[PDB]
Amino acid sequence: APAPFADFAPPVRPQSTLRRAITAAYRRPETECLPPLVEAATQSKEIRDAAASTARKLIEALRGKGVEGLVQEYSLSSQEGVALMCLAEALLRIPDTATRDALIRDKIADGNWKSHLSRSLFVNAATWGLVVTGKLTSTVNDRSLAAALTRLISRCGEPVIRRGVDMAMRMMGEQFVTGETIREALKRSKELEEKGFSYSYDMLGEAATTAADAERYYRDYESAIHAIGKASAGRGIYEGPGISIKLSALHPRYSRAQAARVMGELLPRVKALALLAKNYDIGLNIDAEEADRLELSLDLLEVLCLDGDLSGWNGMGFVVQAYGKRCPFVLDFIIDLARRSGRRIMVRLVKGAYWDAEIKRAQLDGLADFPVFTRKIHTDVSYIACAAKLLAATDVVFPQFATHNAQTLAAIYHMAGKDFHVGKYEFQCLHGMGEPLYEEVVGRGKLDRPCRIYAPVGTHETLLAYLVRRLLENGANSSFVHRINDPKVSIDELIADPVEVVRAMPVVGAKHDRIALPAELFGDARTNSAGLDLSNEETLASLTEALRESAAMKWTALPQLATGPAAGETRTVLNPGDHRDVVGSVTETSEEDARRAVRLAADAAPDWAAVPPSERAACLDRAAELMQARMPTLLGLIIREAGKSALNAIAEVREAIDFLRYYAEQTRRTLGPGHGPLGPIVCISPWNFPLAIFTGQIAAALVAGNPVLAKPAEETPLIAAEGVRILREAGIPASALQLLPGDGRVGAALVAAAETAGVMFTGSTEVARLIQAQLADRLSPAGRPIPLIAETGGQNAMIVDSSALAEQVVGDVITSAFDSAGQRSSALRVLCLQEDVADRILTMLKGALHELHIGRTDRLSVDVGPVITSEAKDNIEKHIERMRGLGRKVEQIGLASETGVGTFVPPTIIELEKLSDLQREVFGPVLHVIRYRRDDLDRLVDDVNATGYGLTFGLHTRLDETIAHVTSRIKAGNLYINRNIIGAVVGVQPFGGRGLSGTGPKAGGPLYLGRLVTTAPVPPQHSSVHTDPVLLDFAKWLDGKGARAEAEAARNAGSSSALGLDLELPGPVGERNLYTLHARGRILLVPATESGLYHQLAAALATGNSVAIDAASGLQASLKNLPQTVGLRVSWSKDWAADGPFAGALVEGDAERIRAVNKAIAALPGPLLLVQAASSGEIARNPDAYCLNWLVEEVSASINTAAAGGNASL
Amino acid sequence: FGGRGLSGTGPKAGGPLYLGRLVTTAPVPPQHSSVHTDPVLLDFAKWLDGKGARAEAEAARNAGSSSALGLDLELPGPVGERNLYTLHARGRILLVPATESGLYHQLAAALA
Amino acid sequence: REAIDFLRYYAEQTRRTLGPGHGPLGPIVCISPWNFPLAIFTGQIAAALVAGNPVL
Ligand SMILES: Cc1cc2c(cc1C)N(C[C@H](O)[C@H](O)[C@H](O)COP(=O)(O)OP(=O)(O)OC[C@H]1O[C@@H](n3cnc4c(N)ncnc43)[C@H](O)[C@@H]1O)c1[nH]c(=O)[nH]c(=O)c1N2
Ligand SMILES: NC(=O)c1ccc[n+]([C@@H]2O[C@H](COP(=O)([O-])OP(=O)(O)OC[C@H]3O[C@@H](n4cnc5c(N)ncnc54)[C@H](O)[C@@H]3O)[C@@H](O)[C@H]2O)c1
C-alpha cells in the first residue's frame, strides 16, 4: 500500500547547481533581472557608434526597396480586402485549376457566390484581417464580410476575383511557406543558397492532441530529414540545410506533469530523428515553446547530448528565448553541457514567440510574477547580454542569432569583432520576412556574415493554423518590422541603443506600467489569491514535503457547538482513491445537538450582528491570509479526502481565498446599520468543492452579520472542519460559527429548526426540492418566507461549429468534461458538434481521452481521480450501461488494476442520437456527444434549453453571427466563448444558473450578500439607465384608469430596476468577462387586492418579465383594456402546475395566505422558485415590498479573446 | 436626413441607402450588415421546417442573415459630437399575398 | 456647402457600390422645394444622375 505522496513529483534527475540557478530565476522580479543584463550587454563608445552607423545603413537600405496594391487598384475597403482573400482561399481549396476558373467565370463572378461556396467562407478571416489591416480581431464579423464580398464582386466582377486568387496563391504557396512540401521547399531554396544563405526547415505542426497525431508528425519529420539530408549532400551542418522540430509535436502529453512519459516515450523518438540527422550530417534544432516546457526540454537535451550513439555529430541545436528571465542561466547550463559532452551545441537565440500567452497564463494561475519580461526593451537588452555570453563561448557552442531587428543585428555584428569563419556563428531569419535585411548582410559585398532562413513547409490548411502567432512577431506596435514601415518612426529612433535606454531609466527594469502582476489583477478592490507553479522544481520539492506532512496529520471533524465540541458517533474518513488510506475521523452530530446548535446561534445572533461590518470583513480577510499560508497543507487534505488532483486542489483553495476576500470587499462597499441580519443561517454544502463552496456560503452569511450552522457534506467533513478552525482563528466567535458534521438528516434537522432564518444550499436539485418543501411550511416571525439560496445541478452543453479549431475544442472538452472526474456542477455533459466536423473532432477527442492517467491523486501525473463513493460510481455506471444497452457507442479508457482499491469511473464518451436521450444530471466523467446540421442550430439551442437546466454553456465559433444568435437564445447563467466551461472565478465569472440549476443570486457576485440581510443594500455598480417599455406602457394604462399612485409606483419601479445592467468585470488579459442583468422569465403573481396586483405587475414588468396571474384571485376585471404590449406579457392561470415553469413568484396576503400559497408553489414541478411575499399593508407602506434584485437574472459571459491565436490589446 | 410617417418614405438623403432606390437592383451599401438575427424570424423558419416547407425555410434563414436590422454605426464627423446611424424595424408591414408560398416569403422578409 | 457635400457624397457612394447589374430606372423627375433651392435641388438630381438616370 503506497505511502501518501511518496511518488508525488520526483524530478527526472537530481538538480545540479546550474539547473537550480535556472529554476531560481523563473519568476525573478524584473528589477532584479535587468542590472546584470545591462552590465553584460555594455559595449564601448566606439562600438556603440559603429553599431549605430551599421544599423542606420541597414535601415536606410531597407526603407529604399502586394495586398496593398490590390486594395488600391480596386478601391477596396478593409472588409472587402479581407472578404476577397477569404474567397480566394476557398477557391484555392478547389484542386483543379480549370474547374476553379470555370466556377469563377460562370458562377462566382456572375452574382451569387453564396450559392456555390458546411463551412463559412470567413473561418480564417481573423488571419486575413491581420494581412490586410495589420490588426487582429478575435472573432469574424461574417455578416459584414458577406456584405463586402457581394459588394466587391457586384462592383468589379471577375477581374478582382482573379487578382485575389493569384495574390492568395502567391502568399500561401510562396510567402508564408517556402513550399507546400519539403521537396518543393528544397527546390525553392537553391536560389538563396547560391547567394550565401542556408536553411532550417519547419514542418508546420505543433501540439499533438493524440498518439496518432504525434505519430504523423514523427513520420513527417523523419521524411523531411531524409529529403533535407539527401539535398544537403554532405555540405555539413553549417553550410548545409537543417531541420527544426517542436517537441510538443512528438508527444500528446509533453508536460512536466507527465515527465516520466516524456522521458520514456518522447525521448526515444527525438533520439531516432537525431540519429537520422547525424547520418546525413545535418542540423536538428529543438524549437522553444511555452515557459513551462523550458526546463523539461533541458532534460531531453541533456540525455541526447550524453548519448554515445549520437557522438561524432555537432548538429544538435536548441533554442533559447531572450524574453525569458532564465535565459542567461539556461545558456550557462547549455554551455557547460556542451563542454561536458564535447558536442558543439547549436544555440539559436530568439527573443520569444509566446509573449501574450505567457502574460495571460501567469495571471490566470495567480503566480508570483511573469516568466518573461514585460517591457520589450528588456528583451532587447537580454538578447544582447545573452549574445555576449554566446560569443565568448564559440569554441564550445555555435551561436545562431535569430532576429530581424537591424539594431540588434548591428550590435552583435560589432560585438563579434573582425575575426570570422564559417562555423563561428551565424544570423538567422524567417522566410519571406528577413531576406530584405539579410541581403544587406550576407556576402562579401555586404557584411560577409551568413544567415540561415527558417523555412516553414506545409499546405494552406496547416499554414493557417498558427499563422496569427507568426504574424504578431512583426505587426505589434513594438515589433521592429512594424516600426521600420511606420514613416512616423525615424531611423534615429530605430537605432536607439536599448542598453543605454534601460540604463538611464529611473527604476532599472521596472515592470510595464500597464500590465498587472497576477496578485494585482483586481487593483485596490482586493488582493488576488496566489497559486503554485507545478512546473517549478523548487515548488514541487517543497510541496512534496508539505503534502507528505499533511498525510501524517490526525485530521478530525467534530460537532463544534458554541459551548465546545460535542460527543457523537465517530467513523473514519477514507481516501476515495484508495480506501486503505485513512485520512481522518469524523464525529457526526446527533439531531438533538443540531437543534441545540440552532438555539445557541439564535441566542448569540445579537452579539455577532453587533460586530461592525468592517470588523466582520476583517475576519474574512484574516481567514484568507491564513488559508493562503496554509495552502500546501490544505491541498494535501483535499487531494486525499475528496480525490482531487493537486492542480484542482490549488484552484479550490484559491477560490476559497477569493470568496473570503470578495465578500469582505463587497461588505466594505455595502453594509450598514439598516441592513439587518436575517438570523441563524444554515449552510449546507456539497462534497465536490469541500473547501471553496463550504467557505463561500459561510463567509457570506457571517459577514452579512448572521451566525452560521455549517453542515458539510458527509463525504468531506475534514477539510470543512479545518476551514472552520481557520475562520475561528481569524476571529469568528465560536457562537457565530458552529460545525455540524453528518449526513442529510443533520441538514434536515437544521433546516427544520424553528429559529433557522435562512438556508444556503449547494447540492443536487433533488435535495434542494426536499429542502424547499420543508421550508414551505415555515414563516419568519414577521410572517414571510424563509430565504433559500439553492444552487443545484447542470446539464451543460457546448456547441461547436465548423469554424472552431479542433485542437482547441478538444482541449477544452477534455478539461470541461473530465477534470475532477466530471464532478463539477459546471462540467460539460453534452457536446454538440456540427455534422461537417463531427467525425474529425470525435476521432481527436477519443484519442485525447486515451492519454489521460486515472489513479489515486497523490501523484502529479494523475489527470483524473476517483469518484467520491461507491454509490456515486454505481449510479454513474448504471447510466453508462443503460446507454450501452440502447446500442449507443461508448468509448472508455481502460483503468489500471491499482484503481481497484478505490472507487473509479473511467472517462467515458457516449454518442447520443438526440439530447432527449438524457434525463437527469449524471455527476461523473461521462461526456455525451450529439451532432447537428447547421440549419438546425436554433432548434438545438431549444433542445439545450428544454432540459430545464441552465448552469454553464459553451460555444466554440469564430463567427459573430453565430455568437449573437446562440448567446441571445441560450438560457444559462454562465456562458463561455472559445474556452472551457469550468473554473468560474469569484468576482470575474460570478457563478450560478437558473431553472433546475439554481435560484440565485450568484455566488461570487454582487447580489449575493443582499439576500442574507433583511433589507438588501445597493450593490456596487448596480443600476441601469434603461426602462422596460412594457412597464412604461403599463404605467400609462394605470394613469388612464385613474390608478395614479400605482402609476407613480410603476414608474419608480421602472427607474429602480437594474434590468439591462451590462458590465465588464476586471480579470486577466486575453479574456473579456461580462456581467449582465436580464429578465428571469415568467413570474407567477398571486395577488389578493387590485392595488397589490398592480404593484406586483409593475415589479415584474420593470424587470422585463412576463407574468402568469392566479385566476383564483378573482381580479380579472382589474386588468381590462390592457395595451397589447402589456397583454402579450400577461396570462391568467387556473392551474399553476400546467402553466410553468415559472422563474419566480410574487405573493400578496396575510401570513396564513402566504404559507398556503408557498406550499402550493413548492409543489409545482420543476425549478425551485424564488418567492417574495408581502401583506397588502406592506405593499402600501414599503415601495420595496417586492425587491427588484430578485426579479432579474444574472448572466456571466467569459470570452477568450486570445482564441484567434493572440491578444490584440497587448 | 429624413423621417418616417407623414415626414417621408425614405430612404434618407445624404445616407447610404439613397442611391439603391434609384436603380432596379439595389447594391449592398457600405457597412450595411448586422450580426443580429430577428428571433421571430428564427421561430418562423423552424415552423416552416416542421411543415416541410424546405425552400421557404431556407429563404427565411437567408432573409434573417441578409437583414441589416440592428446595424449600429458611428459616422465620422467633427470632434465634440457623436453621430450615430442605426437600422430599426419599420413597423407593421401590409402584406398582400396571392399564394401561400408568396405569403411565406413576404412574412420572412418582414419578420427578418 | 450642402450641395457640394451631396455631390461628393453620392459620387463616393457610387464608387463604393455601383456595378453593371445595378441598372438605372430610366428618366427620373426631380421636384424640389423653394426653401433649400440649391442643396435639395442638387442632391436629388445628383443622386438620380449618378445612379445612371437622366433627370427632369
Ligand atoms: C530563425 C528564427 C527561428 C525562431 C524564431 C525567429 C527566427 C528569426 N522565433 C520567433 C522569435 O522568438 C521572435 O518572436 C521574432 O523573431 C521577432 O523578434 P525580432 O528580434 O526579429 O523582433 P523585435 O526586435 O521586434 O522583437 C520582437 C520581440 O520582442 C518581444 N517583446 C514584444 N513585446 C514585449 C514586451 N512588452 N515585453 C517583453 N518582450 C516583448 C517578443 O519576444 C517579440 O517577439 C522563435 N520564437 C520562439 O519562442 N521559439 C522558437 O523556436 C523560435 N524560432
Ligand atoms: N450550482 C452549483 O454551484 C453547484 C456547485 C457544486 C455542486 N452542485 C451540485 O451538487 C451536487 C453534488 O454535490 P452533493 O453530492 O454533495 O449533493 P447532495 O444533494 O447529495 O448533498 C448536498 C448536501 O445536502 C445535504 N443533504 C442531503 N440530503 C439532505 C436533506 N434531505 N436535507 C437537508 N440536507 C441534505 C448533504 O448532506 C450535503 O451536505 C451535484 O448535483 C452538483 O451539480 C451545484
Ligand SMILES: N[C@@H](CCC=O)C(=O)O
Ligand atoms: N463554480 C464551479 C462549479 C461548482 C462545482 O460544482 C466551476 O465553475 O467549476
Ligand SMILES: [Mg+2]
Ligand atoms: Mg448526496
Ligand SMILES: [Mg+2]
Ligand atoms: Mg416544486
